[PDB]
Amino acid sequence: EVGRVVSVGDGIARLFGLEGVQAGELVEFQNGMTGMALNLETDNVGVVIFGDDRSVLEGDSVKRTGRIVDVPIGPGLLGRVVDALGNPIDGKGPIPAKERRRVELKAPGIIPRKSVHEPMMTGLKCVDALVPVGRGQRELIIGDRQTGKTAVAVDAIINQKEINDSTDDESKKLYCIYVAVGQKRSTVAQIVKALEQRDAMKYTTVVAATASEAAPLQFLAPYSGCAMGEWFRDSGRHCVIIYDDLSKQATAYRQMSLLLRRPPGREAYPGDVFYLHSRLLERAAKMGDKSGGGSLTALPVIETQAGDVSAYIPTNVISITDGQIFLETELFYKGIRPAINVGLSVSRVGSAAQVKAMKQVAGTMKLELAQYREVAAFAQFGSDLDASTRQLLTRGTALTELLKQRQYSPMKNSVQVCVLYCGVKGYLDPLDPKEISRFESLFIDYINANHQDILKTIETEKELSEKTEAKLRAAVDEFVAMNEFKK
Amino acid sequence: ASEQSARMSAMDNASTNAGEMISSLTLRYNRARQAKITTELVEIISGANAL
Amino acid sequence: SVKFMDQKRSGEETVYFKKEDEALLRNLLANHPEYDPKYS
């Protein structure tokens, strides 16, 4: 059937007609613009427009296509940048994909799932050690503005090119999806450039719902990304999806709901914000061996104001996630970059999403860092301390100086194991803290020059036998002999 | 003896400074209290008039 | 002031009672030989 526009304003239309409309279907005007029907009132119909409202004219004919709002899926998206609806914006060719998928869908149930056991190598040291991440997990990256969240996510994306290049088994490769809500196109272009400069786009796609783009696209983009990732999840191929920032999506939803004359709630938001984020994040899952064995990891991002996680959106997304990676400005300016607060940051999965070789070191590291955090304040004042307490302070300072990293400079798992071994067994206590930043680098080059076999063995066996232990100890001794530092 | 005299003087100054900080924080607390009341009430009213 | 005082208190108590536990561990097995596995 067809209908006619009755009212138009602020990217929203009120129609008269189309009595056979499905709630949530696409609608087409007589000028190419599209819309989505949400409020099926009695007299009129409330449509949200996918673009500017200058085209609609209060009398224009309108037609229903019968399609529920859907997006394309497949490997045709890899290497491409697309909008919320799958339309490309890279400017190079169309999207070669035949199979589509509905945006809003029912998450998978309790039975076709399994526990999280495989890790998702983030490339960082503090995350992969103290706040591990699994495949099928939903871990939040929450912080303030300009603290290193997008950087964490982009390093997670970049670390995968070595793992993917050194195989042709799709069951082991990890594909990636970056959803940019509210960002400006300059930032998205910078991210695309940073990924292309490192050949990290042949396994990624991007979904850009920027600020100039209307509210419905910002509201739909994360669901479009989850739909694109469900192809990997159900096909047996692992994928990780990153949402930057989710809060922007909540703001867009508030805008749409307020312009549809729906009543507000707390902070002018609706009550359906929890349902919005639960709908979105429960689609991340680790499926069973009967459903292929795929996965869809999620790494949402949230920007708090003044570190207030007592707010309305942070509280919800904290209560519906399997972890937290807090980021602070005090730690960011003190010198700790990434600025991960290892106290508040947790991971309910934990060691199950960690390699044994990393377990052996990270347990001791977490214990030592707890003790160091406990006595750090007392130590600053300056009072006589026992040798054991001083040793604790020295080891905590060493480990804190170890977990620092440059931007876009991730590392393999075996190298993290080796470095944290050097840090835990006491080969950094006498050394000057400020010197460690090169002890790391040189040591890495050394074990990539003359000790590739240790790395291959750790990569294959994924553990530290006594033989590899002794070999690594001998390598560290040779390295300290060949080199000299301030202590 | 000099140590104890200086200790008494320092405690005096610290108590005075604490009183000053208490005054400032009391002002801020009352401001935030009024803001909370106004914000909650405006939320309720805006939800009541959008019916 | 809040986190400052809390962490200072925790560190001070930790250090004090670590020293005391070191001394008690030194002087335990003498005054309580029934627990000492040397005599068992």
Binding site: - | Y29, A32, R33 | S1
Partner: peptide, 12 residues
Amino acid sequence: DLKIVAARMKSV
């Protein structure tokens, strides 16, 4: 906020 200022006042 309120909890922050109240906690600070209590401590002081």
